[PDB]
Design a protein around this ligand. Sequence first.
Ligand SMILES: NC(=O)c1ccc[n+]([C@@H]2O[C@H](COP(=O)([O-])OP(=O)(O)OC[C@H]3O[C@@H](n4cnc5c(N)ncnc54)[C@H](OP(=O)(O)O)[C@@H]3O)[C@@H](O)[C@H]2O)c1
Ligand SMILES: O=C1NC(=O)[C@@]2(CCOc3ccc(F)cc32)N1
Length: 315
Amino acid sequence: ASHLVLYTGAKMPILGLGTWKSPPGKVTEAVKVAIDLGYRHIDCAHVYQNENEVGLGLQEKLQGQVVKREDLFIVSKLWCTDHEKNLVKGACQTTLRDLKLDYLDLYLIHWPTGFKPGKDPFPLDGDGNVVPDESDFVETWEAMEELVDEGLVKAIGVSNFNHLQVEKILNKPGLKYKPAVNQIEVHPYLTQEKLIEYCKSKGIVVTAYSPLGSPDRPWAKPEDPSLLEDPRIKAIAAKYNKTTAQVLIRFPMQRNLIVIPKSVTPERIAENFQVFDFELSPEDMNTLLSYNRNWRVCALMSCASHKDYPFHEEY
Ligand SMILES: NC(=O)c1ccc[n+]([C@@H]2O[C@H](COP(=O)([O-])OP(=O)(O)OC[C@H]3O[C@@H](n4cnc5c(N)ncnc54)[C@H](OP(=O)(O)O)[C@@H]3O)[C@@H](O)[C@H]2O)c1
Ligand SMILES: O=C1NC(=O)[C@@]2(CCOc3ccc(F)cc32)N1
């Protein structure tokens, strides 16, 4: 409904601006452009190293009265080095301070993997593996619930959790709040209909990250399948006189999934909002779904031996 509704009642805007890889000197302008274009949901994260600058763009629009705080859906994410129970409130408070916000609308446990605490976001050992920590995300979750109780965040969720990790939370003795969201990688080459179905049976909204398959991911070694340059999606795009991009964004929306496409380019931010004006005919929907190569762009391979690494499971 141009939004999905979380089990709390909160209306979560269906399209949002993604800010990973959005450089600090560009993201304040991208956020500003986006809110002027009507975007009311911004997806952020401590680890993106730009929440201050996202904060500046929001601030300007808020004091410039272009939007009200109640009309904004700001998401941020607890990073892996901050999973120890006692580190969770501090990590949320830094994020609130950098975003210059009194509360978040959604705070997600970014990855199920907790890493050794410290300033390095990926503590690596001599073998190049990331160093784990003494925590289970069930304890992290208990601290995340405290943020709801104190009013720092309006809802809590998870990101990159496999269905068995969500289950461990749902079956937690003394559970106060469920994940309201599971933000996971979704796009034609990783359609995820089984995890989506599981989250939906549990009443957990799904946000699809990397709808365009992350062309700019640092590790895009040239012989990587490009969804935007994929002749097939370009053809179905042609049928609508829309771009590959607009089609790839319409797809998760049509599957009742929140999309958060990233762009620091003003023109492409406008383009990406110009998707609510058509519907993909069900055949085309089925075409796109069939491309499921189970191809993951964000596999976090460096953490593959972590006890809580999410991707060895089917879904
Ligand atoms: N929770 C997680 O662990 C996680 C993981 C990955 C991503 N995410 C979230 O999902 C967001 C989106 O994913 P992503 O940034 O990884 O990748 P993405 O949105 O799939 O791809 C962004 C790339 O596509 C380009 N692009 C955007 N709009 C375009 C358009 N209309 N036409 C042509 N090219 C276009 C961007 O270029 P320009 O920006 O230069 O225009 C950029 O190179 C992230 O920013 C982040 O907020 C979350
Ligand atoms: O937007 C993103 N959030 C993330 O956790 C991820 C996916 C996995 O890999 C990395 C690596 C570095 C980073 F800053 C971020 C990421 N991308």
